[PDB]
């Protein structure tokens, strides 16, 4: 699919057995999802952006489906204001920017 | 061009006649460039990101070249960690996400 940028590029994702909406973000190195009770081990992390840093929990090898495309990788969980799909998963679904 | 996402989508921009590097950022509504002297009138604005809000200078109708493509629109100038081209100017250069 092709997604224009007139509005925030939100798509449905599936993660942890739940459906959420998330932002496809080429400006994010990492994928950051709203607080959710994912199973298993995790490592503390801090990620930053405009505004400063927030504290998140890093989960590895998480299966996520993004707009119907399966992916598997690292997901950070914490108090983000929006669900963000970063480049670590955008590459896996073969996403590009074109102009 | 077509740009893949294995590395940060950094490109050259010209703004105020100066070359800078900036990140093509589909997760950003707005374009935010690091503190600089820029010709044009501005007003104080606040913008938010992953870790809180910063103060910026809002400049409307600024001519900018992004990866060789012209845009004329609002540029926010302030203490962003990385120069970011957001959707307001990505739309002007005709950028889409594709997968
Ligand atoms: C999400 C994180 C992992 C991402 N950061 C990064 O990818 C890299 O972060 C840094 C931080 C400091 C220095 C160098 C690099 C980011 O903020 N990405 C932003 C761009 C950016 C800002 C500052 C530094 C680097 C990138 C931008 O894409 C995301 O904010 C949008 C998403 C959004 C939409 C609405 C409300 C809030 C947040």
Author numbering:
A (entry chain A), B (entry chain B): 1 to 99
Paper text:
HIV-1 protease (PR) is an excellent target for antiretroviral therapy due to its crucial role in the life cycle of the human immunodeficiency virus (HIV).
PR was complexed with a new potent inhibitor containing an epoxy moiety within a Phe-Phe pseudodipeptide fragment. However, a water molecule was found at hydrogen-bond distance from the oxygen and could provide protons to assist the epoxide opening. From the stereochemical point of view, both oxirane carbon atoms of the EPX inhibitor, selected by PR, have absolute R-configuration. In particular, EPX forms two hydrogen bonds with the carbonyl O atoms of 27A and 48A glycine residues, acting as acceptor, and a hydrogen bond with the NH of aspartate 29A, acting as donor.
